[PDB]
């Protein structure tokens, strides 16, 4: 029902500022709190702060001051802002709604309790890579088709930063699409392949696009593959 | 420190220092390509969906860990596992604990499917050649790729990835062979072979 879709600029320059957005749909902003997350190449969950209608806003302190949370009540949506972009900013970074507790543990009057928090709903996060690095688009190539099914597909080739998405056929071909993890290439250039497996019989009727979005380079591109000579 | 289970027994993952005061503790599962979910909250509680299976720790007597238990264990039960401990004589913590992950000891093999795709004409035309080759949904992870120029061995010019477990707990991966146009013509024929489980697949394209 709720929906979550984060979005930001999938680059940004060192000491430079970072903006990401969080849409929201299926649930008003100001029923909540709402928390970004960044996760790290490898493991680990860091809680970068939270923000609130009423105001009542905190952030990580490790984070020494450089983020700013805040709400559009009219577009619905989460504002995060990262001063200074650092190496050690990149990673992928979740918008979650957080829910808010109350741990009761002695006399109220005498303050014995403790407000606590837990993010129940997360969005699949945004990639963000800190880099002086120029964006490259990527270029596609079709992947033409030869046990009464056939493998189609298509490369996505020499792009930065991360991440690229693939769809079939608008969207409408979801059923046997496998979109590999990208390769990083010793060029520091990523490549990726998405391939779909299809019934056979379906080679001349049905036709194939694979539909390649490189947000960071602003690149859109659809690529139609069909059985060659 | 990382667990593997037998399905069927029980597995324990204890995060976070040992208490002091009242205590709070969220716990999260990661699941492999998903996003992180709530599983836990206030040291015990269980959002609707999460089985009986999951449970949390008391927060008494103090001075003990945050333990997490899931009985029953099942695939599905594979993922990464974080807590979040809120403790009345501590300041806010900010960084999640744990990240250890659960293996679940005895899944069926799972053969790579192997797809091999040659140079496409653009990509020819743009005097570039990459022989493309796709390996999915094997399980357990490791496997080896090695590609072919007729029958030489080449190493020059590989690219590839390290396996990635999916949602569905196996494993993908892909590797690629940048050619010339004029070499991706000159040998008679390309292999790569995938080596899982003591088996070498070999997919095979020609000019
Ligand atoms: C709130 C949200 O973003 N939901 C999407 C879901 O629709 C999609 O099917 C899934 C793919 O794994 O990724 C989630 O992040």
């Known amino acids: 029902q709720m929906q979550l879709q984060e979005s930001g600029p999938g680059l940004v320059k060192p000491s430079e500022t970072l903006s990401l957005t969080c849409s929201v749909s299926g649930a008003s902003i100001s029923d909540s709190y709402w928390s970004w997350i960044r996760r790290s190449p490898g493991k680990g969950l860091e809680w970068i702060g939270y923000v609130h209608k009423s105001g009542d806003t905190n952030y990580s302190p490790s984070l020494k001051s450089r983020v700013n949370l805040s709400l559009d009540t009219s577009k619905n949506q989460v504002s995060l802002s990262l001063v200074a972009a650092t190496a050690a900013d990149s990673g992928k970074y979740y918008c979650?709604?957080?829910?808010?507790?109350?741990?009761?543990?002695?006399?109220?009057?005498?303050?014995?309790?403790?407000?606590?928090?837990?993010?129940?709903?997360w969005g699949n996060g945004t990639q963000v890579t800190v880099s002086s690095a120029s964006t490259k688009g990527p270029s596609v190539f079709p992947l033409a088709p030869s046990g009464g099914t056939a493998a189609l597909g298509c490369l996505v080739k020499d792009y930065f930063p991360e991440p690229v998405t693939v769809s079939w056929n608008s969207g409408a071909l979801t059923s046997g699409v496998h979109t590999f993890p990208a390769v990083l290439q010793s060029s520091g250039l990523y490549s990726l392949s998405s391939v779909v497996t299809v019934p056979s019989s379906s080679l001349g009727t049905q036709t194939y696009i694979c539909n390649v979005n490189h947000k960071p380079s602003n690149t859109k591109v659809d690529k139609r593959v069909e059985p060659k000579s | 420190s990382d667990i593997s289970v037998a399905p069927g027994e029980t597995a324990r993952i204890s995060c976070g220092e040992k208490?002091?005061?009242?205590?709070?503790v969220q716990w999260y599962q990661h699941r492999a390509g998903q996003a992180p979910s709530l599983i836990i909250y206030?040291?015990?509680?269980?959002?609707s969906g999460i089985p009986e299976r999951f449970s949390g720790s008391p927060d008494s007597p103090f001075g003990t860990t945050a333990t997490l238990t899931i009985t029953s264990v099942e695939a599905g039960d594979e993922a990464d596992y974080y807590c979040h401990i809120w403790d009345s004589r501590v300041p806010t913590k900010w960084v999640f604990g744990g990240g250890t992950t659960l293996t679940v000891l005895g899944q069926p093999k799972a053969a790579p499917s192997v797809t091999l795709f040659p140079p496409s004409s653009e990509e020819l035309q743009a005097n570039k050649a990459t022989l493309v080759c796709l390996i999915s949904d094997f399980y357990p992870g490791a496997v080896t790729v090695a590609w072919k120029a007729d029958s030489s061995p080449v190493k020059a010019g590989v690219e590839t990835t390290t396996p990635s477990k999916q949602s569905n707990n196996k494993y993908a991966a892909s590797s690629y062979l940048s050619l010339t146009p004029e070499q991706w013509k000159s040998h008679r024929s390309y292999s790569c072979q995938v080596t899982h489980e003591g088996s070498t697949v070999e997919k095979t394209v020609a000019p």
């Open positions: 206030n040291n015990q509680d269980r959002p």
């Open positions: 979650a709604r957080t829910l808010h507790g109350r741990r009761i543990y002695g006399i109220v009057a005498f303050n014995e309790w403790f407000t606590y928090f837990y993010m129940d709903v």
């Open positions: 208490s002091l005061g009242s205590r709070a």
